[PDB]
């Protein structure tokens, strides 16, 4: 059924990694690699509701501030795993100027200063870290937050480029099972973990394109 990536204090309405090519000053083509939103509603996996955190310890940051450490501190209802089936079927790099970015949107009942820390992991080790501080905008009784077109670094662009140009889907998948992202959204003043999302990847082979499932994170 439907799932929301939401804790008691923060909900992630949207998340998307994209490539935008400017053909001319008035013409833009945009390809979505991964996406969560109104166009791609979140659903659970009928075969697996939850993922035990012990099954993924080795794929994410270890020690203080790492996934295991964060989950133990809680709240439990702020921890999720997203599995993405990425759409790499684009040739929008070829012509014009390109922009790789990631955009995300959040809602909260409270007005907070939030910190979003995103860690890219290769073989379980942290390789890239991006930290962004966001402020609220009051809207319809709640508070809205947006990370608008946060740029991908040269290592993430190079990774995508080489991944797209592999001759086989199995090579793309053996590369992607070693690539993870850990997103932690925190209340900057209280240090409370508002949302913590562990992302795992596979290549999509659907005519519908990019797909995803939301899994609860548990320790049983």
């Amino acid at each position: 059924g439907p799932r929301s990536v939401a804790s008691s204090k923060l909900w992630m309405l949207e998340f998307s990694a994209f490539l935008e090519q400017q053909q001319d000053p008035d013409t833009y083509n945009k390809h979505l690699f991964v996406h969560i939103g109104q166009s791609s509603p979140s659903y659970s996996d009928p075969y697996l509701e939850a993922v035990d955190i012990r099954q993924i310890y080795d794929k994410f940051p270890e020690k203080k501030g790492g996934l295991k450490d964060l989950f133990e501190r809680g709240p439990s209802n702020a921890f999720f795993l997203v599995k993405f089936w990425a759409d790499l079927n684009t040739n929008i790099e070829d012509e014009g100027s390109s922009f790789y970015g990631v955009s995300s949107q959040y809602e909260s009942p409270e007005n907070m200063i939030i910190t979003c820390s995103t860690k890219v992991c290769s073989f379980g080790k942290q390789v890239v870290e991006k930290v962004e501080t966001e402020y609220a905008r009051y809207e319809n009784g709640h508070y809205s937050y947006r990370i608008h077109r946060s740029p991908l670094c040269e290592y993430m662009i190079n990774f995508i480029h080489k991944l797209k140009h592999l001759p086989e889907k199995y090579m793309m998948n053996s590369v992607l099972e070693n690539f993870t992202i850990l997103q932690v959204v925190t209340n900057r003043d209280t240090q409370e973990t508002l949302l913590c999302i562990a992302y795992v990847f596979e290549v999509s082979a659907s005519e519908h394109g990019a797909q995803h499932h939301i899994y609860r994170l548990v320790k049983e």
Binding site: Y155, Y170, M171, E177, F179
Partner: peptide, 16 residues
């Protein structure tokens, strides 16, 4: 095909 070699030509200098 080596997944380790693929991630190494991207992150070998970044591994710290």
């Amino acid at each position: 095909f080596s997944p380790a070699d693929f991630h190494x030509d991207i992150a070998c200098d970044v591994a710290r």
